[PDB]
């Protein structure tokens, strides 16, 4: 009957929020493009409290972590190429002839380099791939670099490695990462088995298109994830149970000559052909791909009803868009992934699929324009050993569904992995009625009001407290300190100098909640209660501040006389 407001600090409550997370690298230097120095060392053992009774709603397609990863990887890519040589004096008209052998793919190009010595003009010979070389005239021998006229071409430093390294994202103080531990999760929906993690699992930022290379696999069955499943033109991420294997080789052996540009800067180019001119023939085991296509078309028939499903190749066009593109060995491959999607299923030649591939050195990454990167050639054969881990399918009318290898920007290459994780902002302050007057972190979040009110200590303890990454981290830490001082000042103005639980003695009106203490301190989670009194939060807070502290302060001011 005689109920009073009591303020509880450290409540296991949260709401959806978007922030910047700290990148952490495995403890395990190589100057790898995604800099190790930027990212903190990983904790030796992660903690994964298995939140019980918590059924949170996840949605891969509205997830700020994916966009944050896109921005972070773009920033790290640009910063890694910042101090490397810029190929400004190489737009010169190139006299090119076909290499005497593929046919016409490699061009023997002569050009006059005018070095910074400025008393010589050196005629030099170099080999360029056909994809990077475009005509400039009706003369069949005069060409230029493909994108050097509308962009500044940055040469990648040969000392930068492109080998994938697992990168974790760890929550800052004041936020939490909730992981969905289900096995057949469909990306968008409620999750029945939720845990809280400080950092995510190892994520290899593999860059590829039409197909996801390396990474985690499904545990129960092949999982097909799409936001709507009927609008079309929405990537149908496919995660597999068993991994096919993309063995890929570039047979040709090449020698890398260097040409001075300025004092301490060099353009690394292709010297001459050693051995015969072969082609890059990626080998995929046909039987295994058969099985994978079966285990995918079954699920697609389940989702799209028993229609005939046809896997077609992508629509024709320029090689960069249409063809699959590895990041293996430091050489950018573009493979004609047509034999893999050439089947009608409804309801015999060879045993290995050989995909031809073309190597390209001048590239435009992240779908940007006006910027371009030159990858210097690698001496010797390149022998990949990748693992088929996922597919990206897109849809296009006689009762047949046409699926094609499609995809999108690199965000869709990480929705396939960060589909079991969500970032949540925690608001530790809450209020509840009591009779008085003046496990791990969120482990009791799904528990009732009673017996969750005994664990605020851990949540209160663990909730709070150079360069571009530096400034972002400084802004994040300052914001966290701000939040913490917001909470502490709210507690101070409420007369709770240092009391996780502080009784107010403000009367508990019956227009907020009419439920009795038994039905308020049991039968409900802190989430349902915080939602319930959401509208009255401002009013209640006002009453805790105005009605008491002021009056209590005046009273104590009047007690010493």
């Amino acid at each position: 009957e005689k109920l009073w407001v009591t303020v509880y600090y450290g409540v296991p409550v949260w709401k959806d929020a978007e922030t910047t997370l700290f990148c952490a690298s495995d403890a395990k230097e190589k100057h790898n493009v995604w800099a190790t120095h930027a990212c903190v060392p990983t904790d030796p053992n992660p903690q994964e409290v298995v939140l019980e009774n918590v059924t949170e709603h996840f949605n891969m397609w509205k997830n700020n972590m994916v966009e944050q990863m896109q921005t972070d990887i773009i920033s790290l890519w640009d910063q890694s190429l910042k101090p490397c040589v810029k190929l400004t004096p190489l737009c010169v008209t190139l006299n090119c002839k076909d290499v005497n052998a593929e046919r016409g793919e490699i061009k023997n190009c002569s050009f006059n380099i005018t070095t910074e010595l400025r008393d010589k003009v050196q005629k030099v010979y170099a080999l360029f791939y056909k994809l990077d070389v475009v005509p400039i005239d009706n003369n069949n021998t005069s060409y230029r670099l493909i994108s050097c006229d509308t962009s500044v071409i940055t040469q990648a430093c040969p000392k930068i490695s492109f080998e994938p390294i697992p990168i974790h994202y760890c929550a800052p103080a004041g936020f939490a990462i909730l992981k969905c531990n289900d096995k057949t999760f469909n990306g968008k929906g409620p999750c029945k088995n939720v845990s809280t993690v400080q950092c995510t699992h190892g994520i290899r930022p593999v860059v590829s298109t039409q197909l996801l290379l390396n990474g985690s696999l499904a545990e129960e069955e092949v999982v097909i994830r799409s936001d709507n499943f009927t609008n079309n033109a929405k990537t149908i991420i496919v995660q597999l149970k068993e991994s096919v294997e993309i063995n890929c080789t570039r047979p040709n052996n090449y020698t890398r000559k260097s040409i001075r540009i300025g004092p301490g800067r060099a353009f690394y180019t292709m010297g001459e052909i050693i051995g015969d001119i072969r082609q890059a023939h990626c080998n995929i085991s046909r039987a295994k791909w058969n099985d994978t296509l079966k285990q995918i078309v079954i699920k697609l028939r389940e989702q799209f009803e028993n229609k005939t499903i046809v896997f077609n190749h992508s629509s024709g066009g320029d090689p960069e868009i249409v063809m699959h593109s590895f990041n293996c060995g430091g050489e950018f491959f573009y493979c004609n992934s047509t034999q893999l999607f050439n089947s009608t299923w409804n309801n015999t030649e060879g045993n290995t699929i050989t995909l031809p591939c073309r190597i390209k050195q001048i590239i435009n990454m992240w779908q940007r324009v006006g910027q371009a990167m030159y990858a210097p050639p690698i001496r010797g054969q390149i022998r990949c050993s990748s693992n088929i881990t996922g597919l990206l399918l897109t849809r296009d009318e006689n009762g047949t569904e046409i699926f094609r290898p499609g995809g999108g920007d690199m965000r869709d290459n990480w929705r396939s992995e960060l589909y079991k994780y969500k970032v949540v902002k925690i608001e530790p302050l809450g209020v509840a009625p009591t009779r008085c007057k003046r496990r791990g972190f969120l482990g009791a979040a799904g528990s009732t009001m009673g017996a969750a009110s005994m664990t605020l200590t851990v949540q209160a303890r663990n909730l709070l407290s150079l360069g571009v990454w530096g400034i972002k981290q400084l802004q994040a830490r300052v914001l966290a300190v701000e939040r913490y001082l917001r909470d502490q000042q709210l507690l101070g103005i409420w007369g709770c100098s240092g009391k996780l639980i502080c009784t107010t003695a403000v009367p508990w009106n019956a227009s907020w909640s009419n439920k009795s203490l038994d039905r308020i301190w049991n039968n409900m989670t802190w989430m349902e209660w915080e939602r319930e009194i959401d509208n009255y939060t401002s009013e209640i807070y006002t009453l805790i501040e105005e009605s008491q502290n002021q009056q209590e302060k005046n009273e104590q001011e009047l007690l010493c006389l």
């Epitope: 009774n53 059924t55 009732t448 009673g450 017996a451 038994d518 039905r519 301190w521 049991n522 039968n523």
Partner: nanobody, 129 residues
Framework: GQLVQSGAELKKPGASVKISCKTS????????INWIRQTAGRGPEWMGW????????????????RVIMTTDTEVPVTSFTSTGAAYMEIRNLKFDDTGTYFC????????????????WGQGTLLTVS
Amino acid sequence: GQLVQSGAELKKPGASVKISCKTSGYRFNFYHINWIRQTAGRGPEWMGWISPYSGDKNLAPAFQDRVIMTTDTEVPVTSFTSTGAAYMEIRNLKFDDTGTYFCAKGLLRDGSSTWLPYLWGQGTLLTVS
């Protein structure tokens, strides 16, 4: 919250029966579900309660070797509701077991009154003749 049970059934003595309870609009996992039977000649009595969270069971002393209770796993439909099901099977029917079997959702998750039945279904008419 709603609890829906299957229709009436008629059986002979010595047979066995299983009756199913389907739950919508409330979290099946949180609350204990318990079975109460309305006898024709004696009035209502308590059968027992089951806790899906741990699968724990407690039965009245007269029916240890007569009834066994089991439960389904909840399928979430939103953050704070889920659909689910329970099953209780009785072996060896006699004429005295004719009556109306009711489900009931428990009152509270914790506190002094967690065990009590609160929210009831329509009742299933079991006839033994």
